């Protein structure tokens, strides 16, 4: 029942390291993914790894999305929702236009560009879940 | 060949922790850096740490970069390439203009602002790698 300095081994129990830790190989945490059309044609694709979610914006705006409006087709599921509101800044292909989408703790995303009805929104990044 | 609750030690083998782990000090993962001029004057500066790449956009647009065009001066090296397309949102100094640059799995980056021949692109963030 002891951890060795060699060998592939499984270690159970809550382990607290009070000092510094270095990992020369990979460090793998559990991962989960989800994607859905938030609303107005906009898709959000998420991958959760520990306390960080990686996001990617996809789809094409296909209907009128009012300024400051809730995206009501799909909410972000609870396990991907942040503790604090996040503002994900994206860009519209082909011009100089930026927008942001907020993700509140409820997962009901909100559009912060102006009223828009067309264009291709993109952007990759992260947000914390706390 | 046993790990102890005190002392500095090196530990080989794949170790799987089934419980929760706390690290009170620093947690250091492998790191490698790279920077280069993708094309048209644009610089991309990268640092990989584990499965995340930290990027910053630099340089000055100094030749005509067509909308949706490949940046063919330098590719992102294979070891920094993502598994799938990433869209890095940036901002042009001095005004309200935004753009994005895509990094596909090949590392041949593409410009998604409009056709441009001047300006100062900037932006810091992360994207994932395998």
């Amino acid at each position: 029942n002891v951890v060795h300095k060699t060998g592939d081994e499984t270690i159970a129990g809550k382990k607290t390291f009070t000092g510094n830790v270095e990992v020369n190989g990979s460090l793998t945490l559990p991962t989960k993914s989800w994607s859905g059309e938030l609303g107005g044609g906009i898709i959000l694709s998420l991958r959760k790894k520990g306390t960080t979610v990686e996001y990617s914006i996809g789809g094409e705006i296909s209907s009128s999305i009012l300024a400051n409006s809730n995206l009501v087709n799909r909410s972000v599921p609870n396990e991907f929702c942040p503790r604090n509101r996040c503002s994900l800044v994206g860009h519209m292909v082909g011009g100089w236009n930026a927008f942001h989408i907020d993700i509140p703790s409820s997962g009901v995303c909100q559009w912060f560009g102006p009223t828009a009805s067309s264009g291709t929104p993109r952007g990759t990044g992260t947000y914390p879940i706390d | 060949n046993v790990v102890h609750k005190t002392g500095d030690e090196t530990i080989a083998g794949k170790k799987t922790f089934t419980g929760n782990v706390e690290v009170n000090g620093s947690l250091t993962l492998p790191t490698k850096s790279w920077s280069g001029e993708l094309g048209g004057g644009i610089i991309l500066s990268l640092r990989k740490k584990g499965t995340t790449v930290e990027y910053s956009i630099g340089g000055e647009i100094s030749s005509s970069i067509l909308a949706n065009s490949n940046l063919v001066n330098r590719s992102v090296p294979n070891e920094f390439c993502p598994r799938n397309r990433c869209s890095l949102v940036g901002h042009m100094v001095g005004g309200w203009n935004a753009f994005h640059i895509d990094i596909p799995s090949s590392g041949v980056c593409q410009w998604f602002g409009p056709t441009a021949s001047s300006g100062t692109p900037r932006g810091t963030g992360t994207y994932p790698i395998d």
Partner: nanobody
Framework: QVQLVESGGGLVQAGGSLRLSCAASESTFSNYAMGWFRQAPEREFVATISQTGSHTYYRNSVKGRFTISRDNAKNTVYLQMNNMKPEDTAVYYC????????????????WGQGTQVTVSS
């Protein structure tokens, strides 16, 4: 890891139906999201489907009329087009890429030869 062979468009009169097919030689077909694009100068997405068929995405003008589906056991993607309209006339292309949420031609990596689809009256 895909070579795409598309088939078989044709002539259909308005309100009619047509099924397009796109097959890959390789069993690695299941590793790709598939998309149908059409070009009446520039190619627009029509419908996309994820690797396992779990997610699909449509252009608003084809919603409720077109269905994209896949049979991974047969390395084939389909586009069932019902209640066809003259604005559906174009050469249709199937494409393979890494994510169904992409809608632009350059976001896909492998392409079929294209098949002509004409809707009249």
């Amino acid at each position: 890891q895909v070579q795409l062979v598309e088939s078989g468009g044709g002539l259909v009169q308005a309100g009619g139906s047509l099924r397009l097919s796109c097959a890959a030689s390789e069993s690695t077909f299941s590793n790709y999201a598939m998309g149908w694009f059409r070009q009446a100068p520039e190619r627009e997405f029509v419908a996309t489907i994820s690797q396992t068929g779990s997610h699909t995405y449509y252009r608003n003008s084809v919603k409720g009329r077109f269905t994209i589906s896949r049979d991974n056991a047969k390395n084939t993607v389909y586009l069932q087009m019902n209640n066809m309209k003259p604005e559906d006339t174009a050469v249709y292309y199937c494409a393979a890429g890494d994510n169904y949420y992409y809608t632009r031609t350059y976001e896909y990596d492998y392409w079929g030869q294209g098949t002509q689809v004409t809707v009249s009256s």
